[PDB]
Amino acid sequence: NGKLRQWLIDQIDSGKYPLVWENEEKSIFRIPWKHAGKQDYNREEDAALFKAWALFKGKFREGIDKPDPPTWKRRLRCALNKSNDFEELVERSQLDISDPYKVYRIVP
Amino acid sequence: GKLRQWLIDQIDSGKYPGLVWENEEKSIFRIPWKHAKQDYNREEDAALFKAWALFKGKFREGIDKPDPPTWKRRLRCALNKSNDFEELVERSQLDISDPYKVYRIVPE
DNA sequence: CAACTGACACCGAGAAACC
DNA sequence: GGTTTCTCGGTGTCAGTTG
Secondary structure, eight states, X not given: OOHHHHHHHXXXXXXXXXXXXXXXXXXXXXXXXXXXXXXXXXXTTTTHHHHHHHHHTTOOOTTTSOOOXXXXXXXXXXXXXXXXXXXXXXXXXXOSSSSOEEEEEEOO | OOHHHHHHHHHHHTOSTTOEEXXXXXXXXXXXXXXXXXXXXXXXXXXXXXXXXXXXXXXXXXXXXXXXXXXXXXXXXXXHHOTTOEEETTSOOOSSSSOEEEEEOOOO
């Protein structure tokens, strides 16, 4: 249980996702949030985390199921919203720039 | 344990629509399972769920607030974890107008 | 028309509570 | 011990909104 917390911390610390820490206390971080309708949407890099969380919890299986980034994007938002681990800073969410992003926070 | 004899009396009563058998030995029966959408009504669709709460004194009429979600959750959690009831997932028609589930009463 | 969202319902699997 | 319920961290559904 509670695999979402440690998984996301490991994803941010990995740096493999070009989602970064916004402070050095490792308590507030960035996260990309590009809309899948924009002409700047690469289905691979933009939906990389959303696919990974579906691959992690055994929801999407390669070469077996039809890909669907919308469902992958919806599952991660509901997980972050429902989990008592991450509180989103909606007033700091800069969701209207060249590369939109949200801001979250982790508590004890 | 009161779940076995109680449910057998509910199906045999025929008071709830959809709660019927599938053989003459009364060992395989359909249970009406809808999603709370469509023509869902708290009366006819969620009647058996209220009976279990009243039977086990979990809901007093006019005192506790009606909560059909947890009423169906209690009956589900007890029905699934019961060893007197086998869920036949292969005949479980979940993709129809009035979806039902097939349960078998194991003898003992 | 696809994509997105919040509000609400749903779920299984250990962990309790309760015979 | 054996049975019913409670917890919890996810997930699904819908109706309206949005790019």
